[PDB]
Ligand binder design. Structure first.
Ligand code: HEM
Ligand SMILES: N#Cc1ccc(COc2ccc(/C=C\c3ccc(C(F)(F)[C@](O)(Cn4cnnn4)c4ccc(F)cc4F)nc3)cc2)cc1
Length: 470
């Protein structure tokens, strides 16, 4: 009834298994039979799926009274991030919170991050056992996750948090990260041992962050441009109340989780693709020689934006491997589709997957082929034509006519896109300077994508060859 119900075999499990294995293949098979609208039930709820640029526009630009993001996620995210932040509050408070973070991610702050990021990556390569010797292999996902957590903590989280990852922050975030698995999506409240560790880790992280805050106020000073010393001053809401340290702590935790899971996954895919394409890596290296010079001066916020192909590699990687595959909202009021007789009721969830349009033939010819040169049409870290609407933070292009929305659109769109492009590009440029990458003998292509966790990542333990240049 209403949108076409998918023909499945069982109650309550539905196609979740088909969805969990590969959402895109599942979304594509449903599109062949049902069109740009399906409705499949993953476990308990009814999830309506609207595909196409309209489908993304319908859900991402849905009216605030009609769709609800927090209700869908809050129970999973709130125990991990903490209270009063992000989803644990009305949408208005989220917009102010987004404002504070985007406030602290200005270009001058981004400028200060580049030398820090280069320092951490160079320090890692020299001190980490992952790249010792002229030639060898290395666990891509494990190594890359360490690099993204070092670069994000040093720049964004600050000195103390960066120092804390040398002792008892590693185990804290591993314990806290156990909160995410979608099993928690439904039973985030059950007192299973993994949830008890999550709660214990969340409390301990909060106490540590606030002590770092209290220590700074005891000195009443400030150093350089981290979102910690920012949220201390960027505390006043429109009502006139300063952001309490507890909220600051929980925001940092949220930024800590969101940045790492997204950066580690994408950067891993970047390294994996470059191993399959040695010609592309050598072309990246030649770009730095041509654009920056034979001397290869240190990377800065300025000379990074000249890298055109480096940006393309990130863009093409995001197109096929963006860690989020399903955006999901809770339907509050019944909504009429603009064109058809279909009506989406309240008992339903809505799911928009901009990745489907990002791998459609009509939008990208030969979509599954990873080719950064397809982007010789246009490049944009900040992108495009459509209208810009402000919901309380900056001015965000809610535009949907685009089939390429890795960071989403509308009032929830990502505010860490610039920081992500800064971090990914910097790490990539540094790794391009230092290494060549090859697959292990006999290995062709790339590993499959794991969709079982909230975030998607490469499937198993993937190793590739590294070879230093000098
Ligand atoms: C490639 C890396 C990243 C990807 C692919 C990504 C993806 C996304 C997507 C798809 C959304 C919209 C989801 C929705 O509408 O429900 C989003 C929102 C957001 N992301 Fe990211 N993100 C990335 C990096 C980051 C980073 C580095 C941060 C913080 C430093 C961050 C913080 C956020 C925040 C705060 C939101 C707002 C969510 C909302 O308002 O509902 N993201 N992200
Ligand atoms: N068998 C089986 C089986 C397998 C798989 C499935 C289901 O498959 C999936 C896969 C992924 C999901 C995803 C989502 C998801 C998670 C977190 C968030 C977020 F909100 F939390 C986030 O946007 C994350 N983020 C973004 N940018 N940065 N961070 C965020 C926002 C603000 C913030 F400050 C920090 C944040 F990190 N948003 C969306 C859901 C289902 C079912 C069954």
């Amino acid at each position: 009834k209403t949108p076409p119900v998918v023909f499945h075999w069982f109650p309550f499990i539905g196609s979740t298994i088909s969805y969990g294995i590969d959402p895109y293949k599942f979304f594509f098979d449903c599109r062949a039979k049902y069109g740009d609208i399906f409705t499949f039930i993953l476990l308990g709820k009814k999830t309506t799926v609207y595909l196409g640029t309209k489908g993304n526009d319908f859900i991402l630009n849905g009216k605030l009274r009609d769709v609800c993001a927090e209700e869908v996620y809050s129970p999973l995210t709130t125990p991990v991030f903490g209270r009063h932040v992000v989803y644990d509050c009305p949408n208005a408070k989220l917009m102010e919170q987004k404002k504070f973070v985007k406030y602290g991610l200005t270009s001058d702050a981004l400028r200060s991050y580049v030398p820090l990021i280069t320092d951490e990556v160079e320090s890692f390569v020299k001190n980490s056992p992952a790249f010792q010797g002229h030639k060898g292999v290395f666990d891509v996902c494990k190594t890359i996750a360490e690099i993204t957590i070092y670069t994000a903590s040093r720049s964004l989280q600050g000195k103390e948090v960066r120092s804390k990852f040398d002792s008892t922050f590693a185990e804290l975030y591993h314990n806290l990260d156990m909160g995410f698995a979608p099993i928690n999506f439904m039973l985030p409240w059950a007192p299973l041992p993994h949830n008890r560790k999550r709660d214990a880790a969340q409390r301990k992280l909060t106490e540590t962050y606030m002590e770092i805050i209290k220590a700074r106020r005891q000195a009443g000073s400030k150093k350089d441009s981290e979102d910690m010393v920012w949220n201390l001053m960027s505390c006043v809401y429109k009502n006139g109340t300063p952001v309490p340290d507890e909220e600051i702590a929980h925001m940092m935790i949220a930024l800590l989780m969101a940045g790492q899971h997204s950066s580690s996954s994408t950067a891993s895919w970047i390294v994996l693709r470059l191993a399959t394409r040695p010609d592309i890596m050598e072309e990246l290296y030649q770009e730095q020689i041509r654009v920056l010079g034979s001397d290869l001066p240190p990377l800065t916020y300025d000379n990074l934006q000249k890298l055109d192909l480096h940006a393309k590699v990130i863009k093409e990687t995001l197109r096929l491997h963006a860690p989020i595959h399903s955006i999901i909202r809770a339907v509050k009021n019944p909504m009429a589709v603009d064109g058809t007789s279909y009506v989406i009721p309240t008992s339903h969830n809505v799911l928009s997957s901009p990745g489907v349009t990002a791998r459609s033939e009509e939008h990208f010819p030969n979509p599954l082929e990873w080719n950064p040169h397809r982007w010789d049409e246009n490049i944009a870290a900040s992108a495009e034509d459509d209208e810009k609407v402000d919901y309380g933070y900056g001015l965000v292009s809610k535009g949907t006519n685009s089939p390429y929305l890795p960071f989403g659109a509308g009032r929830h769109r990502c505010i860490g896109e610039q920081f992500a492009y800064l971090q990914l590009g910097t790490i990539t440029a540094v790794l391009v300077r230092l290494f060549r990458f090859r697959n292990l003998p006999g290995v062709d292509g790339i590993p499959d994508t794991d969709y079982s966790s909230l975030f998607s990542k490469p499937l198993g333990r993937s190793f590739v060859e590294f070879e230093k240049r000098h």
